[PDB]
DNA sequence: TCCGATCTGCTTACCCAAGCGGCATGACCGTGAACCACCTCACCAACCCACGCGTTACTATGCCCAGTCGGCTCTATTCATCGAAGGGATCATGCTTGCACCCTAACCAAGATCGGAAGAGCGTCGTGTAACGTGTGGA
DNA sequence: TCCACACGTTACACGACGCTCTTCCGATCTTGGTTAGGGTGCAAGCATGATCCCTTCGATGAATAGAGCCGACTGGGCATAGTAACGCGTGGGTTGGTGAGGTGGTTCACGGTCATGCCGCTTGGGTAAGCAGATCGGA
């Protein structure tokens, strides 16, 4: 049994070397068909446009993951929390 | 649809983490970081609809969300040029 | 046309077109009028940048012992070179993945 | 429709420079992408210089001047030189 | 010896039916010069290029709108869409 | 001819005409419609009653009967659509806002 | 027996004072100095206009205090009240400055 | 007329009126150089893109105009100056 | 007795408020004029609208296994508390220099005037590029 | 082993060629205006030093909750077929935006000029911080 964090950087490596998506194709895509549903009712999407706005949001969520880490590290911590995310998403401009 | 911002499931969100280089996570980032990608979504996709509704279109071309992501600073190079 | 057409990206001695970039300038309403030397010059720096960015993603490719340069050659590229990761800082990058870095701290 | 893009000059420029490395379709849409974006904001910034001195041409200084604010440090350098070589070859002939 | 036209003549009709009673000095009158400035090419630019990415080569009223939604945040855009709406069909009215 | 009256007061507004000219002489279209300047001159005059209104009651808060630039400051950032549309924008002789972080505050 | 204010309230009083202000902070001759020394390496025997560098100055300021705000943010969020440049550098790497 | 080492004139007090501008209650005592350093490099950056904005006018004087101009392409927008 | 809180009771700098110069600073009249917005007729091209057709977006079905969900262990991490010491705050002195203000001479920005090169725009056309088809090799 | 890419072939449409015509750009001159530099006075904000507090950092220990492992389970992705919603193209009509020529209304600029809003200065009071003193809970 490895001890708590062996395979976490593990993971780091693995998910830093690939480059495919890491939210599931139809969950994503109901979630944006849903968030799409309050400004215009039948409303259509294209494939492209789905693939696009998972690239953009993923991309979004990996970028404030490293501010979170920074902040967190910078408050003498490996962990992680809210307090990090809405300090970085503050600071960023948010 | 209902309920379907419970489909970012907590392994996606470690997987997303993991590619940003964090090692440790706080049992209370899930919940809250969801909202926060919601509120991304919920910006991008509006402008999104916009550029649509302008066109007098109905499907959401990737052109209109290559538009959106372009006007909030955040260029998207791939789709659709 | 008595002459024989000698396309204006041979003069300039490029391979990018400024017949298209006249063209596009032209029509892309930027202004009155476009000089016949802004062409040649906006296609001289964008081939540039382009033989720049290729060079580094073939590098980038042939250490990861690819013949064949994929989104992920291409984000290895811009991100490793300080000017063009400065010059394409807040565009993102289909399918090129993240840098792999690992703070300090968190490493054993 | 005939949509027009930079996938053969990006090619062209690919076996100038990498003379057995080929390009991914994804790939070459990133670069044509890249080049779109750098040729609009070269351009944008073109007028705006040309539009603040009430001029009414895009000649080869107000294109100079736009990559001299755009492009970073040595990039920038470099592009200069690039696009003056080029301009000083096309009017000779 | 070259006029130097300004926004101060309707920046002021427009204080003096808002606060009848109020004066502006002239360093918050190069403010809002440069604000209505400011606006005026961010929309501009926006119904230009909505105008562009349509193949159009014209600004109608649907082109100021979409810049309008698109720039001017929650109630301020749908304001903004009224009062332009409102103006728009005054000037065809007569 | 006729009377001539100007395409401002045809719309009840700002000018039009200004508004026609800089939109034809910016080099944003090939052409310019006839309701472009009309609506984005009635635009730009709903902004600047809207911030003007801000910034005298902001004045009339601070007792003084003339906008300064420190009355517009706070009028902007007071108000949360204007400071979400005019966040990036640096405003002369300004100021702060007097915030102060629980943190810093005595115990 | 002087009276003493303790640590921390004409702190307190100056940051009140100088947020309810807003006249420029940093002297306005060794800033123009400062201001003329750097635009040397761009171009030899530049000249300034007075309003050029007072508009450099107020840029200067804002951008300085916008920077200082963040920076006490994030000094408050490493559970301190006294910033260090640890904060300025976390909060220029995060808002995309370096 | 050469000016050398003037960054020194940006002193310690002027830095504590920023921070207590900025809702700061405690300076650390290595924070001024850090700032002066960040304060270089911003004029550094701002006053380069003014002086190719006029030089590209072939101008020997750095306007208001180009400063606003420069600072725009910045990214932050400056009131009061044009 | 005893000890740390807990009022409590002066002092004591600090800031806000009110009133009197007094001043420079907008508002406005008064021309004045240079500008340019408005009116009107030609017109032609960008736009509108109906119709056709082929993508392609959505729907329904089957399944299966890799991903997800939940629980159990437990141990690395986080948080609370103490000591302290030194890093930073606060205040008194002395004085350096930025601020106020005037002259000058140099220097440069703005306006006028050829007049010559240069770019739009016309018509022809003949290569270059995209669009498709099919072998074939890089992952 | 294969499905994405790199070689043809066609065909058409758009960049190049030539010429006209109009319109900017460079050279040159002139003139006002507007900084850079220099000079003096001074007073106030900066530099330095003393004193001391309370913030932050290291140590130590509790506690806690997130990572790792494992069993159950179940829906995302792949394969298949079907159907119509709609995006793009095409053709004919049409209407409205540009261009040109007058013509007065708007607007900018320069000069008082004048209330007059606001600032400097002084005075006075509300106020909250701060330290010494008396008291009070239990021990």
Same mark, same amino acid.
């Given at each position: 049994?490895? @001890?708590?964090?062996?395979? =976490?950087?593990?993971?780091?490596?693995?998910?830093?070397?690939?480059?495919?998506?890491?939210?599931?194709?139809?969950?994503?895509?109901?979630?944006?068909?849903?968030?799409?549903?309050?400004?215009?009712?039948?409303?259509?999407?294209?494939?492209?446009?789905?693939? =696009?706005?998972?690239?953009?949001?993923?991309?979004?969520?990996?970028?404030?993951?490293?501010?979170?880490?920074?902040?967190?590290?910078?408050?003498?911590?490996?962990?992680?929390?809210?307090?990090?995310?809405?300090?970085?998403? @503050?600071?960023?401009?948010? | 649809?209902?309920?379907?911002?419970?489909?970012?499931?907590?392994?996606?969100?470690?997987?997303?983490?993991?590619?940003? +280089?964090?090692?440790?996570?706080?049992?209370?980032?899930?919940?809250?970081?969801?909202?926060?990608?919601?509120?991304?979504?919920?910006?991008?996709?509006?402008?999104?609809?916009?550029?649509?509704?302008?066109?007098?279109?109905?499907?959401?071309?990737?052109?209109?969300?290559?538009?959106?992501?372009?006007?909030?600073?955040?260029?998207?190079? +791939?789709?659709?040029? | 046309?008595?002459?024989?057409?000698?396309?204006?990206?041979?003069?300039?001695?490029?391979?990018?077109?400024?017949?298209?970039?006249?063209?596009?300038?032209?029509?892309?309403?930027?202004?009155?009028?476009?000089?016949?030397?802004?062409?040649?010059?906006?296609?001289?720096?964008?081939?540039?940048?382009?033989?720049?960015?290729?060079?580094?993603?073939?590098?980038?490719?042939?250490?990861?012992?690819?013949?064949? #340069?994929?989104?992920?050659?291409?984000?290895?590229? #811009?991100?490793?070179?300080?000017?063009?990761?400065?010059?394409?800082?807040?565009?993102?990058?289909?399918?090129?993945?993240?840098?792999?870095? #690992?703070?300090?701290?968190?490493?054993? | 429709?005939?949509?027009?893009?930079?996938?053969?000059?990006?090619?062209?420029?690919?076996?100038?420079?990498?003379?057995?490395?080929?390009?991914?379709?994804?790939?070459?849409?990133?670069?044509?992408?890249?080049?779109?974006?750098?040729?609009?904001?070269?351009?944008?910034?073109?007028?705006?210089?040309?539009?603040?001195?009430?001029?009414?041409?895009?000649?080869?200084?107000?294109?100079?001047?736009?990559?001299?604010?755009?492009?970073?440090?040595?990039?920038?350098?470099?592009?200069?030189?690039?696009?003056?070589?080029?301009?000083?070859?096309?009017?000779?002939?």
């Amino acid at each position: 049994r490895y @001890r708590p964090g062996t395979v =976490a950087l593990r993971e780091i490596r693995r998910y830093q070397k690939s480059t495919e998506l890491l939210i599931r194709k139809l969950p994503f895509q109901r979630l944006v068909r849903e968030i799409a549903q309050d400004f215009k009712t039948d409303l259509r999407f294209q494939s492209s446009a789905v693939m =696009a706005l998972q690239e953009a949001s993923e991309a979004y969520l990996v970028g404030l993951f490293e501010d979170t880490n920074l902040a967190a590290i910078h408050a003498k911590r490996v962990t992680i929390m809210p307090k990090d995310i809405q300090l970085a998403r @503050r600071i960023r401009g948010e | 649809l209902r309920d379907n911002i419970q489909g970012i499931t907590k392994p996606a969100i470690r997987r997303l983490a993991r590619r940003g +280089g964090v090692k440790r996570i706080s049992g209370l980032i899930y919940e809250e970081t969801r909202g926060v990608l919601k509120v991304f979504l919920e910006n991008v996709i509006r402008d999104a609809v916009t550029y649509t509704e302008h066109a007098k279109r109905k499907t959401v071309t990737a052109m209109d969300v290559v538009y959106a992501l372009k006007r909030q600073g955040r260029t998207l190079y +791939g789709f659709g040029g | 046309a008595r002459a024989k057409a000698k396309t204006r990206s041979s003069r300039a001695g490029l391979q990018f077109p400024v017949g298209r970039v006249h063209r596009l300038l032209r029509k892309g309403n930027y202004s009155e009028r476009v000089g016949a030397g802004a062409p040649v010059y906006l296609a001289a720096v964008l081939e540039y940048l382009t033989a720049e960015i290729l060079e580094l993603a073939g590098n980038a490719a042939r250490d990861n012992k690819k013949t064949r #340069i994929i989104p992920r050659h291409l984000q290895l590229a #811009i991100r490793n070179d300080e000017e063009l990761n400065k010059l394409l800082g807040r565009v993102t990058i289909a399918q090129g993945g993240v840098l792999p870095n #690992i703070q300090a701290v968190l490493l054993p | 429709s005939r949509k027009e893009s930079y996938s053969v000059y990006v090619y062209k420029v690919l076996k100038q420079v990498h003379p057995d490395t080929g390009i991914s379709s994804k790939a070459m849409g990133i670069m044509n992408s890249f080049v779109n974006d750098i040729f609009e904001r070269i351009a944008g910034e073109a007028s705006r210089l040309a539009h603040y001195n009430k001029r009414s041409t895009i000649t080869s200084r107000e294109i100079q001047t736009a990559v001299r604010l755009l492009l970073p440090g040595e990039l920038a350098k470099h592009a200069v030189s690039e696009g003056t070589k080029a301009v000083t070859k096309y009017t000779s002939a």
